[PDB]
């Protein structure tokens, strides 16, 4: 029972479920959540710290770069993987695990990658969200040793190599359903769904591809056989000359170009929380907007705001009196 940081973020109190609890210092000390550090001094102390061996982290990296997941992995992640590897090797016999895993099998469909399947509240033609089910919706929930990993990359490598891992649910998991980003220029796959530029060739070219991994160790990934996904419509447009200074915003063509620092003030990024015990004493129902600061005059916006505006093609026609920032 090797606990990853995902169980600690989700308040997964599975300490009574297992007995061989082993954790890393750098998977518990980096968490900036206050409630986790609060409950850490409250939770019963039967977890213990263990260090992996350099040979086993070397082997774990050796087949993890054959799985095609090594750029997506992190150092403490490899610590967790090789810790579980060492525990299952030292307790259980080593003949269960298999190395140099299976090949991929390609089977595409007509469905869009943005089809809203496997969302709990979404239902095509009954799927309801009940307070009996709010504790149930975590993931695709299906003996002695296991993992408490929430990342798909960890589940992927642990299941390709062959360990039975589990979730916040007490029962061991069977299938892994998720999405990955694949470059369609260099054909390199990254398990990090947040990024937009690929690590290999750096173009803004990652696209979603669905991946399902069975309990045997066989993986199959579905592409989308849809002409809308691979369409060069809104891609070539005339670019402005690069401007410098403290105020210039650039069209963001590379993943690591140096942008000028344009942050928001504290009052500008306060969101009203309504379930605070002292919210009712507020003279206004809402947090007051910020108009006085210099960031308000410069029309500085959050990264989240204006997402569908970027998805419009620049070679189009907007409204006559509107200006796009």
């Amino acid at each position: 029972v090797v606990a990853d940081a995902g169980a600690f973020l989700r308040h997964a109190a599975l300490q009574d479920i297992g007995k061989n609890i082993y954790t890393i210092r750098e998977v518990v000390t980096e968490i900036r959540d206050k409630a986790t550090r609060r409950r850490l001094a409250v939770l019963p102390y039967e977890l213990r710290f263990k260090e992996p061996l350099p040979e086993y982290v070397r082997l774990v990296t050796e087949f993890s770069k054959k799985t095609g997941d090594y750029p997506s992995l992190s150092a403490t992640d490899i610590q967790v993987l090789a810790l579980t590897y060492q525990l299952e090797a030292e307790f259980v016999g080593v003949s269960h695990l298999k190395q140099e895993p299976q090949k991929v099998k390609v089977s595409s469909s007509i469905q869009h990658p943005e089809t809203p399947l496997h969302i709990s509240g979404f239902h095509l033609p009954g799927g309801w969200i009940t307070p009996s089910n709010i504790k149930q919706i975590q993931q695709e929930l299906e003996v002695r040793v296991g993992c408490l990993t929430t990342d798909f990359a960890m589940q992927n490598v642990l299941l390709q190599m062959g360990l039975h891992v589990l979730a916040v649910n007490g029962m061991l998991i069977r299938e892994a359903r998720s999405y990955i980003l694949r470059c369609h220029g260099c054909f390199k796959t990254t398990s990090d769904m947040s990024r937009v530029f690929c690590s290999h060739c750096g173009n803004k070219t990652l696209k979603k591809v669905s991946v399902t991994v069975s309990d045997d160790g066989t993986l199959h990934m579905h592409f989308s056989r849809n002409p809308k996904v691979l369409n060069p419509r809104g891609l070539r447009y005339s670019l402005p000359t690069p401007k410098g200074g403290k105020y210039a915003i650039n069209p963001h063509l590379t993943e690591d170009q140096r942008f000028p620092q344009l942050r928001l003030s504290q009052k500008a990024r306060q969101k009203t929380n309504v379930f605070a015990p002292d919210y009712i004493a507020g003279v206004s129902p809402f947090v007051e907007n910020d108009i006085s600061s210099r960031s308000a005059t410069l029309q500085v916006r959050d990264s989240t705001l204006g997402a569908g505006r970027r998805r419009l093609n620049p070679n189009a026609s907007r409204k006559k009196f509107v200006k796009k920032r």
Binding site: D278, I280, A281, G282, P285
Partner: protein, 61 residues
């Protein structure tokens, strides 16, 4: 009818000259009615009050 009270949390200072304290009040009638009131003078966390009337609620929203 006169009801006893309790101070749960001091919230802030209100009034024109900052003379009043906005505070939260817990009841000693074994009820969990935490009502926000305005008091005059020095109050700290744990004080006990005497309300002439309880049906009035202070300036909320």
């Amino acid at each position: 009818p006169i009801k006893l009270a309790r101070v749960t949390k001091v919230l802030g200072r209100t009034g024109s000259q900052g003379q009043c304290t906005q505070v939260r009040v817990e009841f000693m009638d074994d009820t969990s009615r935490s009502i926000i009131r305005n008091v005059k003078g020095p109050v700290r966390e744990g004080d006990v009050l005497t309300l002439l009337e309880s049906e009035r609620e202070a300036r909320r929203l």
